[PDB]
Amino acid sequence: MDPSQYASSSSWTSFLKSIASFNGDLSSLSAPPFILSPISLTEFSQYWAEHPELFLEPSFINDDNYKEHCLIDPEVESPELARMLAVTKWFISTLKSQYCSRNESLGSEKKPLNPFLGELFVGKWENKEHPEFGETVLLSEQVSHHPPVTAFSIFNDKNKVKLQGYNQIKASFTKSLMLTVKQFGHTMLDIKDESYLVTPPPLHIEGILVASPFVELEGKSYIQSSTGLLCVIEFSGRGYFSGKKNSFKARIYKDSKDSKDKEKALYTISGQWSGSSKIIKAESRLFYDAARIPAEHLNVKPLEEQHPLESRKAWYDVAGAIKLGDFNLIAKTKTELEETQRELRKEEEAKGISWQRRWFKDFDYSVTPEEGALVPEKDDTFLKLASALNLSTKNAPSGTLVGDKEDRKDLSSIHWRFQRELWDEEKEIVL
Numbered sequence: 132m133d134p135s136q137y138a139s140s141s142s143w144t145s146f147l148k149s150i151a152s153f154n155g156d157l158s159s160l161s162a163p164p165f166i167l168s169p170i171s172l173t174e175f176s177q178y179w180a181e182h183p184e185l186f187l188e189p190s191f192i193n194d195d196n197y198k199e200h201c202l203i204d205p206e207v208e209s210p211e212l213a214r215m216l217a218v219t220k221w222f223i224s225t226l227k228s229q230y231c232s233r234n235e236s237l238g239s240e241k242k243p244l245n246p247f248l249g250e251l252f253v254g255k256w257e258n259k260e261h262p263e264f265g266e267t268v269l270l271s272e273q274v275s276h277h278p279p280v281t282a283f284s285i286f287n288d289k290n291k292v293k294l295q296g297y298n299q300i301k302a303s304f305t306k307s308l309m310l311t312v313k314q315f316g317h318t319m320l321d322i323k324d325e326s327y328l329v330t331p332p333p334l335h336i337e338g339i340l341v342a343s344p345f346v347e348l349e350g351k352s353y354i355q356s357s358t359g360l361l362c363v364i365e366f367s368g369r370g371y372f373s374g375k376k377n378s379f380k381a382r383i384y385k386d387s388k389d390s391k392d393k394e395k396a397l398y399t400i401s402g403q404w405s406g407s408s409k410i411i412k413a414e415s416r417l418f419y420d421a422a423r424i425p426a427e428h429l430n431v432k433p434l435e436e437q438h439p440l441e442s443r444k445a446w447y448d449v450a451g452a453i454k455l456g457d458f459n460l461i462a463k464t465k466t467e468l469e470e471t472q473r474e475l476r477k478e479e480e481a482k483g484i485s486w487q488r489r490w491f492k493d494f495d496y497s498v499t500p501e502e503g504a505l506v507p508e509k510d511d512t513f514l515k516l517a518s519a520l521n522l523s524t525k526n527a528p529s530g531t532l533v534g535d536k537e538d539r540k541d542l543s544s545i546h547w548r549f550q551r552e553l554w555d556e557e558k559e560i561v562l
């Protein structure tokens with residue numbers, strides 16, 4: 132059918148009614164084929180680094196050049212501040228990838244494949260047009276299925292730029308079928324010895340009633356640096372109706388203390404994360420223009436060469452059935468994929484290959500670990516940056532501060548950490 136028929140179709144109305152009895156498990160939503168995406172959530176990890184030059188720019192900023200790596204302020208006060216600006220522009224540059232790519236490729240946000248446990252998605256940006264970049268590697272692993280959790284690392288050994296993080300959600304519908312989504316997890320970015328802690332924002336999915344879903348961001352994201360500098364980014368959907376969307380204001384502070392007072396911002400950035408934004412130092416200059424720089428997608432090896440744990444190969448028949456809009460064959464291929472994976476895990480275990488906690492481990496940060504649980508080393512980055520920001524260290528929604536209501540709920544404190552050795556010693560998977 133034409134998208135203009137979607138909203139009043141029997142399938143759509145049937146799906147909307149089924150939401151009334153929503154069990155809280157999104158996996159269950161029996162979404163019609165036309166609103167299904169053939170991309171797994173393990174691929175979404177790639178959206179952290181689709182502008183290789185912006186990902187890597189902080190590593191090129193040093194005591195001896197920083198005033199030459201700060202396009203909107205050649206008079207920036209410090210290399211630390213220049214780097215905070217660049218990491219902020221990078222983080223803004225991810226949002227269009229993360230929150231808009233299905234709209235442009237499929238014509239609307241669609242319901243992604245729920246990843247199997249142990250599912251892997253790997254690739255690299257080889258950065259051939261820029262020798263000084265080197266290859267940047269993405270590893271993405273499905274570390275939990277009940278509930279779904281994706282962990283990931285993106286690293287550039289040449290420039291000592293490395294990213295790790297993990298993600299999970301909780302969602303519920305309101306009466307008009309808006310879907311409120313709270314993200315959980317965080318991502319850490321190290322630029323040589325300097326670190327940055329990033330928290331993803333809450334969001335809501337609009338347009339379900341009309342069968343044309345889309346994301347809009349709300350609340351706040353933070354970027355807290357080991358330098359003490361902090362960026363607080365606030366999202367809003369003001370001006371819908373006037374055709375405005377995807378707005379934000381980001382303010383960078385000397386430290387989290389100054390951040391409790393807006394008038395102390397060293398810079399204020401505002402605009403649209405999916406279009407353009409300006410910056411004003413404590414008149415204005417263009418900070419980022421998402422239309423001027425296309426996304427660059429990572430290199431993924433051919434399907435014929437992929438290991439059967441790899442997302443695209445693994446989801447291949449299911450994807451083909453979705454593309455064909457065949458309810459029958461989608462139900463069949465899915466049941467087949469479950470049998471494949473069940474048998475594959477058996478073989479992995481038979482060869483003594485660990486498939487479960489493949490490249491990431493769950494660390495317990497609660498002051499009551501289970502006897503031999505994995506626990507963080509003493510100068511752990513996460514603890515020190517969470518403390519500078521007064522971030523709760525528990526499994527609260529991303530961005531929860533100490534003493535917020537959500538920080539008060541006997542909540543756990545388990546966080547996923549990448550183990551590089553595990554990739555170096557990886558038994559099967561290559562790029």
Ligand SMILES: CC[C@H](C)CCC(=O)[C@@H](C)[C@H]1C(=O)C[C@H]2[C@@H]3CC=C4C[C@@H](O)CC[C@]4(C)[C@H]3CC[C@]12C
Pocket residue numbers: 157160162166172175176178229230240241242243298300310312314336339344346
């Ligand atoms: C009723 C189904 C509706 C058609 C869509 C509901 C649905 O598919 C939800 C689960 C889906 C979306 O609608 C948008 C997805 C988020 C998009 C972007 C990202 C960023 C990434 O770093 C982490 C994953 C996340 C948060 C997606 C999670 C699943 C959502 C909410």
